[PDB]
Design a protein around this ligand. Structure first.
Ligand SMILES: O=C(C1CCN(c2ccncc2)CC1)N1CCN(S(=O)(=O)c2ccc3cc(Cl)ccc3c2)CC1
Ligand SMILES: [Ca+2]
Length: 223
């Protein structure tokens, strides 16, 4: 997260760190056995790390659970990043408590102007490299589809939305991918992509989770 702030330990209890020997993507715990992340975060041998703050120190509230099954969206297109969503079933159920909790799926789509909380252990530099060991947070409003489509001509589909600042300075970044974009307690987006981090007029693009609730529910119910 660029231009964000330190969230604080376990203040984003649904945030998960997808680990394959190291943190590579974020995710959101949607229930005790399921994590939602970006399909572009797909990897084999994903160990889901819950209750994380400092990803390099065992602080005592972590739950490291290996994935049993990964389900990338049937229409995920790695070229356009359309349908950039993936479900990860945990081998064993996460013990949900105050530091590790699920985030609610949206009942409706969030709109432009909606303020959201984006979190991740991604790069904090817009021009440079610095990865935080502790979870970073960023408050960013969902931008209007017009601003989004104008920033990314012909690249924004109905399953995407821009969130952030057109002035740049604040944005998701590498390593934040798959992370949650929660607005008013509901997971409305998944850190999907951007042309860079915190670039002027190039807001981050997120997977519009509200378009996948049916798929998410149906998938979970049958796996
Ligand atoms: O521009 C890109 C891709 C982004 C996706 N992209 C297309 C191409 C055509 N249509 C849709 C998307 C192809 C190029 N990247 C540069 C930025 N990097 S990044 O700095 O690692 C990164 C990763 C995830 C991000 C997520 C957000 Cl929400 C904002 C910035 C982000 C920046 C990722 C690849
Ligand atoms: Ca830790």
């Amino acid at each position: 997260i660029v231009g964000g702030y330190t969230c604080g330990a376990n203040t984003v209890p649904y945030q998960v760190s997808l680990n394959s020997g190291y943190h590579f993507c974020g995710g959101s715990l949607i229930n005790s056995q399921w994590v939602v992340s970006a399909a572009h975060c797909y990897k084999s041998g994903i160990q889901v790390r819950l209750g994380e703050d400092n990803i390099n120190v065992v602080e005592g509230n972590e739950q490291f659970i290996s994935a049993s099954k990964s389900i990338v969206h049937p229409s995920y297109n790695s070229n356009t990043l359309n349908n950039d969503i993936m479900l990860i079933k945990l081998k064993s159920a996460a013990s949900l408590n105050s530091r590790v909790a699920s985030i609610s799926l949206p009942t409706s789509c969030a709109s432009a102007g909606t303020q959201c909380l984006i979190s991740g252990w991604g790069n904090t530099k817009s021009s440079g490299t610095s990865y935080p060991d502790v979870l970073k947070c960023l408050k960013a409003p969902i931008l209007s589809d017009s601003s989004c489509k104008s920033a990314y001509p012909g690249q924004i589909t109905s399953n995407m939305f821009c969130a952030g600042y057109l002035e740049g300075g604040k944005d998701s970044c590498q390593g934040d991918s798959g992370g949650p974009v929660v607005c008013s307690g509901k997971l409305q987006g998944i850190v999907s992509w951007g042309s860079g981090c915190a670039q002027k007029n190039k807001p981050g693009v997120y997977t519009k989770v509200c378009n996948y609730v049916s798929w998410i529910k149906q998938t979970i119910a049958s796996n």
